[PDB]
RNA sequence: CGAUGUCGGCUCGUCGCAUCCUGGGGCUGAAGAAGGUCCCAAGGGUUGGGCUGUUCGCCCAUUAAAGCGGCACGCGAGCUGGGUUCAGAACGUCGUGAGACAGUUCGGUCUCUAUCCGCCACGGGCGCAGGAGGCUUGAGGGGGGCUCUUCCUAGUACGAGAGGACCGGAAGGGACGCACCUCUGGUUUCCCAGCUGUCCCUCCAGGGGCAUAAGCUGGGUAGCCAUGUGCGGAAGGGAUAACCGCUGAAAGCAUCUAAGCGGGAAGCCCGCCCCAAGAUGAGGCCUCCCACGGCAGCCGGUAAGGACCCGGGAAGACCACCCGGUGGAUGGGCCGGGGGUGUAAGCGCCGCGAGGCGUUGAGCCGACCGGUCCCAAUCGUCCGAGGUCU
RNA sequence: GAAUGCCGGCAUGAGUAACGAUAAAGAGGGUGAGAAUCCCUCUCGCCGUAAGCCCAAGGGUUCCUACGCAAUGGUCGUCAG
RNA sequence: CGUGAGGGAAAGGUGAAAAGAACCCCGGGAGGGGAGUGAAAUAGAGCCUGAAACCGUGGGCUUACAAGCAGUCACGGCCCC
């Protein structure tokens, strides 16, 4: 037996390929399916990706956003079926895989340390020019 | 012991 | 009452109705029947099951004779499931349907010689305020001249884990007949690659 | 507990165990065969195989990589121009460990030879 | 994960600024309060002429926690502070405004009034 | 601690009984297929230097 | 008195029941709800904090409840040392004085090694009439045993109103317990990077040592883990306690009883989980070997088998246990993947320069999932039945 | 036969605690009846207001060389105060 | 041993005579085995006699379901004379 393959076989039903690639430091918007008492609506969450912990189907990622004065961190399974879609808002450039340190930075300090990732901004704009 |  | 011999594979979580469901994946069957314990012969009702094929050049003559009376290949493991007389001569995952509750028996992980804090959740001693080399010690173990001794079954240090453990009433999340797979919500005793026994539940 | 923890400690702290493997590496690549105790020999197979493998690759990067362990350019030159070519078609297994029949007199230690393979 | 001695910010206009939890009103001996649980607490700092003063023993419901709370969809949410809203014995808010986001768990636990006064439910 | 101490001297019976697990086992030895000398298994012969058919060490 | 360490606390339990809560009852000055009093009941439970050395007690916030006692006022060869209980000092008091005070005040040396019993774990030996490899029965033990909130029934019964059920039925919590690592969250002593001072390689570039037994800092697989996850307390059957009966005399009536028969507890038995035939009363089933050679015995060669040795293991202090040993994937190497880190070196271009950009998600890379005989488990040895008597 | 008697001998605890700073080791080559421990080389680590050098007390041949290994050295010893 | 005044041990025996064991053997030595001396060599210098505790080797009887101040009384089994 190959035990690793069997887990990968159980997981294949639930893997997604519709979601666009992103990186810690990018600003991202997650359109997320929510249940509010009776109905179920779609609530968008937009902030900076601070962490991506990889494990194949079990990979997750963490988004941080300020909301009416308070910091809110929100953790998302990458292959969650509740995620309607993910839309890139901005490419940022980090120098390390985890961005915990920005929790202690001012707004200006963050801006100066996570600058636009012009190289990948170009790759996005280069594509999407599909015809 | 200090049995005092 | 029905059961099967399995292999613990690993853990994952699937999604069912917008909820995350942790699971343990178990490679249960297929288990051929090798011998039947009858009240006329042995005194009780059970099935002896085989599991995992074995190198026939690795199974001595006493065991080969046993496999020959049932006309089966050599199997690595032989275990009995009591009070189960299946119709066929082979037992596969399809005796379980999704939604049934099962009990699973495996051999827990072995901590070797375990201190009383890890073995029995004792409180140890303080870590400052004068505490003198008793930081993880059991404390007192008795009284004085009456009874002048220590109770049997006293909780003390010693080996821990690598013991038979059954967890009971686990929900079967899915069955995949094509791969001899059995999904089960929650945690199962032992390490990945450990043998496990899956039985229909006894909680009503 | 120790479940699934790879590698030996050899009653040496972290800097001392590393220097131990490097010195054994220098002496094995220098003499072709050495004698140590059995546990040290077993652990030397991997530390040396890796350097020999990178020496098969042959780039400047590989050479700078090996020099972090071996430190002696002549020894590295010898590993690149004489040792390495002997193993162009060999996929692992560049070293072998055989056990000797008698123990060291002062402490009982079982001994073993460790050598580069033909 | 709020326990006795834990300080909490005050996410309302009651007048209290900081409260110190003294009890987890959940059973005989709950170790920890989370989002949607009620505590008893002492008002450690107030603004002058508010509805509550320093040294008042009040009730409040926890609306934000720094320990991240998990969810059945497999996700989680985590705030920067520990915040609560002061209630009376009918779980209704004793102030008229609610500052900052609150968790969606409060809805299930029957604190609908705070939820609607909240500027964002996450 | 309070210096635990032997309460009674051990008798010759008990002292010797404790040692019932002290005998040495004789060394495991097999003949060398090349020179027929008695040697431990899985070691190079220390008399003719052979292992696994071929010569390995000088002796 | 050739010494039985002395208060309180901490840790660790265990027992009694005159029961604090939870279960079952009778009486009530019991309408309902909620109480009072007494009976049965020891299975489980019986919280966190302020003050004091305190025990105790009061107080805060809870709670189903915040029970009372025993075990050398349980437990100092288990810990503490606040008090008490030497030597210093001082206050009030007493004494001419030296000094004195269950009066107060500040300070004050608590001893590495367990021989026997006992306890927790783990082996060695022999036994279980032939010898073996498997799979099991369960005598007998151990674990477990808690409990609250809301909703529906129904704003119904009951009650002027306030208030507000039994029985039955759902949902969700607290604390405890066993297992687990998919998620959340730790660790991750060298898996990756960044930084300083210094010495060194080899001058630049690039690196190595030391700054801890990681120099420092930012991260971090597997494993081990709780703060995280799954599951458990039952259900059910049986016999009972207090208590309530049916039928029914002695005693024409009455009587739960003298003959007989019911109902009835979180408690008792079984049922659930675990250990278990040294259960010497040493059990049972399947399968394998077999009448070998020399004066219930004897000593040698074999049998089925086992051990020795070796490669290892989420097994482990040693021992044991489990897997493998060339008809082999057991460890090491190598390769593919996962994973961590976060774009190596070198070269090219831009800048006076610190640097920046591209090559490039590169380079490095523990343990995880697999592949591959490249390296090492070579070659072997030694035990091992001929089955006692009616 | 006893005086926790006196002197001496030998037991038990036990192959048990310990073998005296956690600055640290590895290999090769020699010597020799015998080598983790002596000699030589290379690598590694530790002190460097010393763990380096020179005086004075105190000690009194311990200095140098050859030949030695019973005892002394907390192991070993071919080395050595 | 004590700065010092001062304190203050242990330790006798080959044989009549050294005839004190040439020489060979294993062993680095120590030690031993022969040969030889002697009336005698468990008189061989670690030496007259050589008690006891204590240690070991060999043999007889006995012991792994059993409760003990260890003995004693009885009977039986085995071994010896
Ligand atoms: Mg499969
Ligand atoms: Mg996996
Ligand atoms: Mg922002
Ligand atoms: Mg920048
Ligand atoms: Mg910057
Ligand atoms: Mg860019
Ligand atoms: Mg895993
Ligand atoms: Mg499904
Ligand atoms: Mg099993
Ligand atoms: Mg196990
Ligand atoms: Mg575990
Ligand atoms: Mg272990
Ligand atoms: Mg402990
Ligand atoms: Mg435990
Ligand atoms: Mg445990
Ligand atoms: Mg613990
Ligand atoms: Mg504690
Ligand atoms: Mg404590
Ligand atoms: Mg603690
Ligand atoms: Mg400590
Ligand atoms: Mg102390
Ligand atoms: Mg102390
Ligand atoms: Mg201590
Ligand atoms: Mg300490
Ligand atoms: Mg006592
Ligand atoms: Mg006591
Ligand atoms: Mg007693
Ligand atoms: Mg075990
Ligand atoms: Mg268990
Ligand atoms: Mg359930
Ligand atoms: Mg298992
Ligand atoms: Mg197995
Ligand atoms: Mg451990
Ligand atoms: Mg450890
Ligand atoms: Mg491994
Ligand atoms: Mg050590
Ligand atoms: Mg050490
Ligand atoms: Mg060492
Ligand atoms: Mg050691
Ligand atoms: Mg270091
Ligand atoms: Mg060597
Ligand atoms: Mg060595
Ligand atoms: Mg490697
Ligand atoms: Mg080059
Ligand atoms: Mg070998
Ligand atoms: Mg050996
Ligand atoms: Mg030696
Ligand atoms: Mg030695
Ligand atoms: Mg505010
Ligand atoms: Mg606010
Ligand atoms: Mg005010
Ligand atoms: Mg104030
Ligand atoms: Mg005030
Ligand atoms: Mg309020
Ligand atoms: Mg709203
Ligand atoms: Mg003590
Ligand atoms: Mg102590
Ligand atoms: Mg002590
Ligand atoms: Mg002692
Ligand atoms: Mg005595
Ligand atoms: Mg003794
Ligand atoms: Mg005696
Ligand atoms: Mg005796
Ligand atoms: Mg004896
Ligand atoms: Mg003994
Ligand atoms: Mg012993
Ligand atoms: Mg022996
Ligand atoms: Mg006395
Ligand atoms: Mg005495
Ligand atoms: Mg006495
Ligand atoms: Mg005393
Ligand atoms: Mg005494
Ligand atoms: Mg005493
Ligand atoms: Mg305490
Ligand atoms: Mg008690
Ligand atoms: Mg009573
Ligand atoms: Mg009641
Ligand atoms: Mg009651
Ligand atoms: Mg009333
Ligand atoms: Mg009532
Ligand atoms: Mg009543
Ligand atoms: Mg009554
Ligand atoms: Mg009770
Ligand atoms: Mg009680
Ligand atoms: Mg205070
Ligand atoms: Mg207190
Ligand atoms: Mg008190
Ligand atoms: Mg008291
Ligand atoms: Mg008092
Ligand atoms: Mg009540
Ligand atoms: Mg009350
Ligand atoms: Mg209290
Ligand atoms: Mg008491
Ligand atoms: Mg009590
Ligand atoms: Mg008493
Ligand atoms: Mg008393
Ligand atoms: Mg008293
Ligand atoms: Mg006491
Ligand atoms: Mg005490
Ligand atoms: Mg003490
Ligand atoms: Mg005490
Ligand atoms: Mg005591
Ligand atoms: Mg004591
Ligand atoms: Mg004690
Ligand atoms: Mg005592
Ligand atoms: Mg203790
Ligand atoms: Mg004191
Ligand atoms: Mg006082
Ligand atoms: Mg006065
Ligand atoms: Mg007077
Ligand atoms: Mg007077
Ligand atoms: Mg006076
Ligand atoms: Mg006084
Ligand atoms: Mg007093
Ligand atoms: Mg007094
Ligand atoms: Mg007084
Ligand atoms: Mg006082
Ligand atoms: Mg005073
Ligand atoms: Mg005092
Ligand atoms: Mg002081
Ligand atoms: Mg003190
Ligand atoms: Mg000590
Ligand atoms: Mg003992
Ligand atoms: Mg002890
Ligand atoms: Mg005793
Ligand atoms: Mg014992
Ligand atoms: Mg045994
Ligand atoms: Mg039998
Ligand atoms: Mg048999
Ligand atoms: Mg068997
Ligand atoms: Mg039977
Ligand atoms: Mg059984
Ligand atoms: Mg039973
Ligand atoms: Mg018994
Ligand atoms: Mg119960
Ligand atoms: Mg209603
Ligand atoms: Mg009705
Ligand atoms: Mg009402
Ligand atoms: Mg109900
Ligand atoms: Mg309990
Ligand atoms: Mg546990
Ligand atoms: Mg686990
Ligand atoms: Mg994992
Ligand atoms: Mg984790
Ligand atoms: Mg994590
Ligand atoms: Mg390492
Ligand atoms: Mg490295
Ligand atoms: Mg440097
Ligand atoms: Mg140089
Ligand atoms: Mg440079
Ligand atoms: Mg560079
Ligand atoms: Mg250096
Ligand atoms: Mg240094
Ligand atoms: Mg430091
Ligand atoms: Mg470093
Ligand atoms: Mg971390
Ligand atoms: Mg780190
Ligand atoms: Mg990890
Ligand atoms: Mg991890
Ligand atoms: Mg992990
Ligand atoms: Mg774990
Ligand atoms: Mg927890
Ligand atoms: Mg009646
Ligand atoms: Mg009647
Ligand atoms: Mg009548
Ligand atoms: Mg009757
Ligand atoms: Mg009845
Ligand atoms: Mg009944
Ligand atoms: Mg119940
Ligand atoms: Mg069993
Ligand atoms: Mg048996
Ligand atoms: Mg059994
Ligand atoms: Mg018998
Ligand atoms: Mg019998
Ligand atoms: Mg029998
Ligand atoms: Mg019996
Ligand atoms: Mg049997
Ligand atoms: Mg072992
Ligand atoms: Mg091992
Ligand atoms: Mg051993
Ligand atoms: Mg071992
Ligand atoms: Mg062995
Ligand atoms: Mg076995
Ligand atoms: Mg087996
Ligand atoms: Mg085998
Ligand atoms: Mg073989
Ligand atoms: Mg084999
Ligand atoms: Mg392999
Ligand atoms: Mg395989
Ligand atoms: Mg491999
Ligand atoms: Mg290994
Ligand atoms: Mg890779
Ligand atoms: Mg990858
Ligand atoms: Mg990756
Ligand atoms: Mg990668
Ligand atoms: Mg670049
Ligand atoms: Mg580059
Ligand atoms: Mg560069
Ligand atoms: Mg230029
Ligand atoms: Mg840059
Ligand atoms: Mg490297
Ligand atoms: Mg590599
Ligand atoms: Mg192949
Ligand atoms: Mg052979
Ligand atoms: Mg007398
Ligand atoms: Mg004496
Ligand atoms: Mg005397
Ligand atoms: Mg005497
Ligand atoms: Mg004397
Ligand atoms: Mg004396
Ligand atoms: Mg003496
Ligand atoms: Mg004498
Ligand atoms: Mg004496
Ligand atoms: Mg002596
Ligand atoms: Mg003796
Ligand atoms: Mg002795
Ligand atoms: Mg002695
Ligand atoms: Mg001894
Ligand atoms: Mg030993
Ligand atoms: Mg030893
Ligand atoms: Mg001992
Ligand atoms: Mg020991
Ligand atoms: Mg000692
Ligand atoms: Mg030791
Ligand atoms: Mg010492
Ligand atoms: Mg030393
Ligand atoms: Mg030091
Ligand atoms: Mg040392
Ligand atoms: Mg230093
Ligand atoms: Mg250092
Ligand atoms: Mg070396
Ligand atoms: Mg060396
Ligand atoms: Mg050396
Ligand atoms: Mg050497
Ligand atoms: Mg040579
Ligand atoms: Mg040496
Ligand atoms: Mg030597
Ligand atoms: Mg040395
Ligand atoms: Mg030297
Ligand atoms: Mg070298
Ligand atoms: Mg300097
Ligand atoms: Mg300087
Ligand atoms: Mg030093
Ligand atoms: Mg002198
Ligand atoms: Mg001299
Ligand atoms: Mg000497
Ligand atoms: Mg010597
Ligand atoms: Mg010598
Ligand atoms: Mg001499
Ligand atoms: Mg000496
Ligand atoms: Mg010596
Ligand atoms: Mg010494
Ligand atoms: Mg010599
Ligand atoms: Mg000298
Ligand atoms: Mg003197
Ligand atoms: Mg004196
Ligand atoms: Mg003198
Ligand atoms: Mg004197
Ligand atoms: Mg004499
Ligand atoms: Mg004479
Ligand atoms: Mg004469
Ligand atoms: Mg001569
Ligand atoms: Mg000669
Ligand atoms: Mg010779
Ligand atoms: Mg000779
Ligand atoms: Mg010599
Ligand atoms: Mg001689
Ligand atoms: Mg001899
Ligand atoms: Mg002689
Ligand atoms: Mg003669
Ligand atoms: Mg003689
Ligand atoms: Mg004589
Ligand atoms: Mg004589
Ligand atoms: Mg004479
Ligand atoms: Mg004599
Ligand atoms: Mg004598
Ligand atoms: Mg004698
Ligand atoms: Mg004698
Ligand atoms: Mg002897
Ligand atoms: Mg004997
Ligand atoms: Mg004998
Ligand atoms: Mg007997
Ligand atoms: Mg019996
Ligand atoms: Mg017997
Ligand atoms: Mg007996
Ligand atoms: Mg007697
Ligand atoms: Mg008798
Ligand atoms: Mg008689
Ligand atoms: Zn040979």
The DSSP result for D31-82, as a single string, is HSEEEEEHHHHHHHHHHHHHHHHHHHH--HHHHHHHHHHH--HHHHHHIIII
Query: Which chains reach chain C with 3 or more Cβ–Cβ distances below 8 angstroms?
Result: A, D, E
User: Which of F40, F50, F52 is best to mutate for the D interface (most D CBs within 10 A)?
Assistant: F40
Residues C47, C37: Cα–Cα separation, whole Å: 6
The three-state secondary structure class of A2 is coil
Contacts of F57 in chain D (CB under 8 A): 100, 113
User: Chain A: nearest CA to E34, how far in angstroms?
Assistant: 16
In sequence order, the 6+-apart residues with CB closer than 8 A to the CB of D79 are D29, D51, D52, D55, D66, D70
- Check: CB of residue D116 under 8 Å from CB of residue D83: yes
Peptide bond into C30 cis (omega under 30): yes
Beta bridge partners of F30: F39
- Check: CB of residue F58 under 8 Å from CB of residue F51: no
User: Chain A: nearest CA to E9, how far in angstroms?
Assistant: 11
In sequence order, the 6+-apart residues with CB closer than 8 A to the CB of A85 are A18, A19, A31
Closest CA to E103 of E39, E45, E37: E37
Residues F32, F41: Cα–Cα separation, whole Å: 9
- Check: CB of residue E86 under 8 Å from CB of residue E117: no
Sign of the CA dihedral running D21, D23, D24, D29: positive
Residues E63, E98: Cα–Cα separation, whole Å: 10
Burial class from Cβ neighbours inside 10 Å (0-12, 13-18, 19+) for residue C106 reads: buried
Other Cβ atoms less than 10 A from the Cβ of A57: the count is 19
In sequence order, the 6+-apart residues with CB closer than 8 A to the CB of E25 are E37, E38, E39, E40, E59
What is the distance, to the nearest Å, from the Cα of residue C120 to the centroid of all Cα atoms in its chain? 21
Spell out the alpha helix ranges (H) of chain A: 3-11, 107-113, 118-126
Among A36, A70, A103, select the one facing E64 at the smallest CB separation: A70
CB-contacted nucleotides of strand G (7 Å): 3, 5-6, 10-14, 47-49, 60-66, 71-72, 74-81, 85-86, 111-124, 132-138, 142-143, 148, 173-185, 189-190, 201-202, 206-211, 213-215, 218-225, 227-235, 272-275, 284-289, 304-306, 308-317, 324-325, 327-328, 332-335, 337-346, 357-359, 361, 363-372, 374-381
Residues C85, C81: Cα–Cα separation, whole Å: 9
- Check: CB of residue A42 under 8 Å from CB of residue A34: yes
Closest CA to F38 of F23, F54, F27, F25: F27
The separation, in Å, between residue E55 CA and nucleotide G47 C1' comes to 24
For the record, the structure tokens of A68 come out as 């009416």
CA angle A42, A43, A47 (to 5 degrees): 140
Kindly identify which residue of chain D lies nearest to residue C118, measuring between CA atoms: D1
Residues D25, D36: Cα–Cα separation, whole Å: 12
Distances (CA, A) of E100 to A58, C95, C107, C137, E121: 32, 54, 50, 48, 9
- In the complex, which nucleotide's C1' lies nearest to the CA atom of residue F15? H12
Residues D107, D110: Cα–Cα separation, whole Å: 9
User: Chain C: nearest CA to A4, how far in angstroms?
Assistant: 8
Rounding to the nearest 10 degrees, give the CA dihedral for residues C15, C18, C22, C25.
Answer: -20
The three-state secondary structure class of D26 is helix
Burial class from Cβ neighbours inside 10 Å (0-12, 13-18, 19+) for residue E28 reads: exposed
In sequence order, the 6+-apart residues with CB closer than 8 A to the CB of C138 are C116, C122, C155, C156, C157
The separation, in Å, between residue D105 CA and nucleotide I27 C1' comes to 21
- Check: CB of residue E33 under 8 Å from CB of residue E39: yes
The separation, in Å, between residue C66 CA and nucleotide G290 C1' comes to 19
Residues E100, A67: Cα–Cα separation, whole Å: 7
Experimental method: X-ray
Tell me whether strands E7-10 and E83-87 are parallel, antiparallel or unpaired.
parallel
Q: Which helix (H) or strand (E) holds C27?
A: strand C20-27
For the record, the structure tokens of F56 come out as 């390995």
Peptide bond into C147 cis (omega under 30): yes
Residues C46, C37: Cα–Cα separation, whole Å: 5
CB-contacted nucleotides of strand I (7 Å): 54-56
For the record, the structure tokens of D107 come out as 């402490």
Q: Could you give all domains of chain D from N- to C-terminal order, each with its CATH number?
A: 14-118 (3.90.1030.10)
Rounding to the nearest 10 degrees, give the CA dihedral for residues E37, E38, E44, E45.
Answer: 80
Residues C202, C63: Cα–Cα separation, whole Å: 33
The separation, in Å, between residue C128 CA and nucleotide G92 C1' comes to 39
Q: Which helix (H) or strand (E) holds A74?
A: strand A70-77
What is the distance, to the nearest Å, from the Cα of residue E5 to the centroid of all Cα atoms in its chain? 15
For the record, the structure tokens of E9 come out as 């910010």
In sequence order, the 6+-apart residues with CB closer than 8 A to the CB of C74 are C53, C54, C55, C56, C58, C59, C63, C64, C67
- Check: CB of residue D91 under 8 Å from CB of residue D52: no
Closest CA to C102 of C187, C161, C170: C170
CB-contacted nucleotides of strand H (7 Å): 11-15, 24-28, 34-37, 42-45, 75-76
Sign of the CA dihedral running C38, C44, C47, C49: negative
User: Which of A37, A51, A72, A74 is best to mutate for the E interface (most E CBs within 10 A)?
Assistant: A72
Contacts of A45 in chain E (CB under 8 A): 122
For the record, the structure tokens of C200 come out as 């229909």
Tell me whether strands D111-116 and D95-99 are parallel, antiparallel or unpaired.
antiparallel
How far does the centroid of ligand 283 lie from the alpha carbon of residue C154, in Å?
27
Distances (CA, A) of E91 to A35, E22, E60, E86: 23, 18, 8, 9
- Check: CB of residue C13 under 8 Å from CB of residue C20: yes
A10:C20 CB<8 A: no
First vs last Cα of chain A: how many Å apart? Answer: 47
How far does the centroid of ligand 255 lie from the alpha carbon of residue C86, in Å?
96
For the record, the structure tokens of E46 come out as 């107030």
Beta bridge partners of C183: C25
Task: Name the residue with tokens 């697990």.
Answer: F21
Q: What residues does the ion ligand 12 have nearby, CB within 5 Å?
A: C 112; D 1
Task: Name the residue with tokens 């996570």.
Answer: A114
- Check: CB of residue F49 under 8 Å from CB of residue F56: yes
- Check: CB of residue C171 under 8 Å from CB of residue C101: yes
Closest CA to C183 of C192, C196, C174: C174
- Check: CB of residue A86 under 8 Å from CB of residue A20: yes
For the record, the structure tokens of A89 come out as 């808002």
CA angle C118, C120, C126 (to 5 degrees): 70
Q: What are phi and psi of D70, to 5 degrees?
A: -90, -35
Residues E59, A92: Cα–Cα separation, whole Å: 44
- Check: CB of residue A63 under 8 Å from CB of residue A30: yes
In sequence order, the 6+-apart residues with CB closer than 8 A to the CB of E67 are E1, E34, E78
Residues E38, C28: Cα–Cα separation, whole Å: 47
Q: Chain D residues contacting C, CB < 8 Å? A: 1, 3
The separation, in Å, between residue D48 CA and nucleotide H51 C1' comes to 37
Distances (CA, A) of C61 to C4, C50, D80: 26, 17, 56
Residues C51, F6: Cα–Cα separation, whole Å: 56
Half-sphere exposure of D6 (CA within 13 A, CB side): 2
Contacts of A77 in chain C (CB under 8 A): 20
For the record, the structure tokens of E13 come out as 């206009």
- Check: CB of residue E6 under 8 Å from CB of residue E21: yes
Contacts of A83 in chain C (CB under 8 A): none
Residues E110, A3: Cα–Cα separation, whole Å: 46
Other Cβ atoms less than 10 A from the Cβ of A101: the count is 12
- Residues composing chain D: 118
In sequence order, the 6+-apart residues with CB closer than 8 A to the CB of E17 are E9, E10, E45, E46, E47
The three-state secondary structure class of C171 is strand
Residues E116, D13: Cα–Cα separation, whole Å: 61
Residues A68, E14: Cα–Cα separation, whole Å: 18
Sign of the CA dihedral running C78, C84, C89, C95: negative
Residues D55, D87: Cα–Cα separation, whole Å: 10
Other Cβ atoms less than 10 A from the Cβ of E60: the count is 28
DSSP label at residue C108: P
Residues D113, D103: Cα–Cα separation, whole Å: 13
Query: Which chains reach chain E with 3 or more Cβ–Cβ distances below 8 angstroms?
Result: A, C
- Check: CB of residue E85 under 8 Å from CB of residue E11: yes
For the record, the structure tokens of A124 come out as 């996005």
Other Cβ atoms less than 10 A from the Cβ of C25: the count is 28
- Check: CB of residue E76 under 8 Å from CB of residue E96: no
Closest CA to E41 of E70, E5, E17: E5
């Amino acid at each position: 037996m190959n035990r690793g393959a069997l887990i990968k076989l159980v997981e294949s039903r639930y893997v997604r390929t519709d979601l666009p690639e992103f990186r810690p430091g990018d600003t991202v918007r997650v359109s997320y399916k929510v249940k509010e008492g009776n109905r179920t609506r779609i609530q968008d969450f937009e902030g900076i990706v601070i962490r991506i912990r990889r494990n194949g189907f079990n990979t997750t990622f963490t988004v941080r956003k300020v909301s009416y004065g308070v910091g809110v961190e929100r953790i998302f399974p990458l292959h969650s079926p509740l995620i309607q879609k993910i839309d890139i808002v901005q490419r940022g450039r980090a120098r390390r895989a985890k961005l915990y340190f920005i929790r202690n930075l001012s707004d200006r300090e963050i801006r100066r340390k996570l600058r636009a990732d012009r190289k990948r901004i170009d790759q996005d704009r280069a594509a999407e020019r599909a015809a | 012991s200090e049995a005092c | 009452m029905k059961g099967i011999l399995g292999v613990k594979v690993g853990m994952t979580r699937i999604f069912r109705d917008d909820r995350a469901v942790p699971v343990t994946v178990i490679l249960a069957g297929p288990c051929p029947v090798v011998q039947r314990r009858t009240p006329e012969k042995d005194g009780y009702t059970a099935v002896q099951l085989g599991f995992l094929p074995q190198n026939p050049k690795r199974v001595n003559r006493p065991l080969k004779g046993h496999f020959a009376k049932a006309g089966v290949e050599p199997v690595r493991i032989l275990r009995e499931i009591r009070d189960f007389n299946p119709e066929g001569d082979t037992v596969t995952v399809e005796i379980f349907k999704p939604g049934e509750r099962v009990d699973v028996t495996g051999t827990s992980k072995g901590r070797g010689f375990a201190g009383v804090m890890k073995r029995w959740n004792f409180a140890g001693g303080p870590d400052s305020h004068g505490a003198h080399k008793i930081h993880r010690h059991p404390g007192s173990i008795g009284n004085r001249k009456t009874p002048g001794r220590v109770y049997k079954g006293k909780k003390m240090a010693g080996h821990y884990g690598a013991e038979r453990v059954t967890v009971m009433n686990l929900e079967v999340v899915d069955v995949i007949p094509e791969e001899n797979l059995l999904l089960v919500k929650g945690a199962v005793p032992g390490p990945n690659g450990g043998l496990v026994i899956v039985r229909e539940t006894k909680k009503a | 507990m120790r479940h699934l923890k790879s590698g030996r400690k050899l009653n040496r702290h972290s800097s001392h165990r590393l220097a131990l493997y490097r010195n054994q590496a220098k002496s094995l690549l220098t003499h072709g065969r050495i004698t140590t105790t059995v546990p040290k020999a077993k652990e030397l197979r991997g530390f040396v195989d890796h350097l020999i493998h990178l020496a098969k690759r042959g780039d400047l990067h590989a050479r700078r990589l090996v020099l972090r362990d071996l430190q002696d350019v002549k020894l590295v030159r010898k590993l690149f121009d004489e040792i390495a070519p002997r193993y162009r078609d060999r996929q692992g297994g560049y070293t072998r460990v055989l056990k000797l029949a008698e123990r060291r007199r002062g402490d009982g230690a079982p001994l073993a030879l460790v050598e580069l393979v033909e | 994960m709020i326990q006795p001695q834990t300080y909490l910010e005050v996410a309302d206009n009651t007048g209290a600024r900081k409260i110190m939890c003294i009890r987890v009103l959940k059973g005989s001996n709950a170790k920890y309060a989370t989002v949607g649980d009620v505590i008893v607490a002492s008002v450690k700092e107030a603004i002058p002429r508010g509805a509550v003063k320093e040294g008042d023993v009040v009730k409040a419901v926890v609306v934000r926690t720094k320990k991240e709370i998990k969810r059945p969809d497999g996700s989680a949410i985590r705030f920067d502070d520990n915040a609560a809203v002061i209630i009376n014995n009918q779980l209704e808010p004793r102030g008229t405004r609610v500052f900052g986001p609150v968790a969606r768990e409060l809805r299930e636990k029957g604190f609908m009034k705070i939820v609607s006064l909240a500027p964002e439910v996450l | 601690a309070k210096h635990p101490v032997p309460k009674k001297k051990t008798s010759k019976a008990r002292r010797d009984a404790r040692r019932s697990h002290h005998a040495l086992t004789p060394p495991t030895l097999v003949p060398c297929p090349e020179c027929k000398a008695m040697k431990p298994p899985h070691t190079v012969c220390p008399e003719c230097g052979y292992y696994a058919g071929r010569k390995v060490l000088e002796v």
